[PDB]
């Protein structure tokens, strides 16, 4: 028994593609024989996808519910998952086992979906540090953020406290936004940015969040929890 | 100034949501405006996903490319974000906020947006222990697992080298399938299970996964890397 999988590729978001897994050695309309789908993302482990069963059953995940099918066509003898409006995180290798009666055996080799509208670069990471801090009121409180390109002083410091928007603080690195307060500065080292608040006060316990634009895509640092001590 | 945001709520994947972010105190049409649409997802950070600008430039993430589209209405002084063909991962806060001639002010107060067709339960979640381990050639190895909820004897181990697909060792608990090394074998405890290789061989430098069949969705294990000393 063997499954011959084929298909896949490089293909932009929003697209669609249909992976075929051909059956040798066996009928995919013999009772008790199953079709089933398993990806893997790049590093990752295994996702159960679908089922499809000889009397018609399925079962579907709901990571693709809505967007994929899955079918047995025993006229060629070849089942198929059809994927329709693909996601960069649908990326991973599909592979299509045999199913039987309940274990998936016989996989087929795997193919890799890689969705993507990009070129070869890479988006410019912002690394903010620390991820959280500790503070007092009236502390002096630093945070720093990097990104992994220049970025000039194209770069925007946010406030957000749970449940809330975000706020605008500083702009082009050291401008206040008006309306905020002065103990809010920023600065730039040439290698870093910081972001002081030069005395702490109870209305500042929030999470701070850089972000450049430089280029898009716009990107922010993971963000910096400023919690009580 | 504000925007003011509506829309939203829990949808199936595969279904489509229109967000609106209707303008006050400034016009969509006045040049130097833009509109940036951003999302969070439920504990992590920002990231961007559209920007539209009053002269029709426009730019989107690889994330929503070909699926979400966004516009700004002029008769209307309102913008949209079009979303389609939503998935799991699309599932966050979206915030609408002003762009101006470069940065993100007067954000809207953001809403939900959950993409999912589950009840309120949870799906079985299995655990392994170790996620690595280092072996000789000779040594007897032990990997256990365990699911969230009973799954009676429905557990199946695998196999999977680097660049492979998955293997089959051992299904319901204890049945070594054929063809498979005896030196595997499996067992439970009625609190976990366990898959015992009794004298490791070069051959079985692999990454194995448990994996349940109790219930749909059938799940996995994160796997355990057996790796040389």
């Known amino acids: 028994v063997q499954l011959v999988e084929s298909g896949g590729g490089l293909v932009q978001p929003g697209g669609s593609l249909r992976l075929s897994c051909a059956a040798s050695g066996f009928s995919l309309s013999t009772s008790g024989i199953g079709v089933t789908w398993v990806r893997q993302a790049p590093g990752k482990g295994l996702e159960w996808?679908?089922?499809?069963?000889?009397?018609?059953?399925?079962?579907?995940?709901d990571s693709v519910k809505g967007r994929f099918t899955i079918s047995a066509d025993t006229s060629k003898n070849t089942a198929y998952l059809q994927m329709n409006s693909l996601t960069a995180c649908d990326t991973a290798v599909?592979?299509?086992?045999?199913?039987?009666?309940?274990?998936?055996?016989?996989?087929?080799?795997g193919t890799l979906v890689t969705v993507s509208s990009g070129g070869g670069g890479s988006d410019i990471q912002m690394t903010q540090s620390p991820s959280s801090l500790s503070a007092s009121v009236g502390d002096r409180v630093t945070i720093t953020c990097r990104a992994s390109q220049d970025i000039s002083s194209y770069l925007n410091w946010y406030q957000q406290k749970p449940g809330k928007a975000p706020k605008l603080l500083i702009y082009?690195?050291?401008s206040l936004h008006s309306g905020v307060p002065s103990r809010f500065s920023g600065s730039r080292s040439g290698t870093d940015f910081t972001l002081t608040i030069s005395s702490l006060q109870p209305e500042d316990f929030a999470t701070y969040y850089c972000?450049?634009?430089?280029?898009?895509?716009?990107?922010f640092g993971q963000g910096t929890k400023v919690e009580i001590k | 100034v504000q925007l003011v945001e509506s829309g939203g709520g829990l949808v199936q994947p595969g279904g489509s949501l229109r967000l609106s972010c209707a303008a006050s105190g400034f016009s969509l049409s006045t040049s130097g405006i833009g509109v940036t649409w951003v999302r969070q997802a439920p504990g992590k950070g920002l990231e961007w996903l559209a920007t539209?600008?009053?002269?029709?430039?426009?730019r989107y993430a690889d994330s929503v490319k070909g699926r979400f589209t966004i516009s700004a209405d002029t008769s209307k002084n309102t913008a949209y974000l079009q979303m389609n063909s939503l998935t799991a991962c699309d599932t966050a806060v979206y915030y609408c906020?002003?762009?101006?001639?470069?940065?993100?002010?007067?954000w809207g107060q953001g809403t939900l947006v959950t993409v999912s067709s589950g009840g309120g339960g949870s799906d079985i979640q299995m655990t392994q222990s170790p996620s690595s381990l280092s072996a000789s050639v000779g040594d007897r190895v032990t990997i256990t697992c365990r699911a969230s909820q009973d799954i009676s004897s429905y557990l199946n181990w695998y196999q999977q080298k680097p660049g492979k697909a998955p293997k089959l060792?051992?299904?319901?608990?204890?049945?070594?399938?054929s063809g498979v090394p005896s030196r595997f074998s499996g067992s439970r405890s009625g609190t976990d299970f366990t898959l015992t290789i009794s004298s490791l061989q070069p051959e079985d430098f692999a990454t194995?996964?448990?994996?349940?069949?109790?219930?749909?969705?059938?799940?996995?294990?994160?796997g355990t890397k057996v790796e040389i000393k």
């Open positions: 082009y690195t050291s």
């Open positions: 906020a002003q762009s101006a001639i470069s940065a993100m002010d007067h």
């Open positions: 972000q450049q634009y430089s280029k898009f895509p716009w990107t």
């Open positions: 539209i600008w009053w002269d029709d430039d426009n």
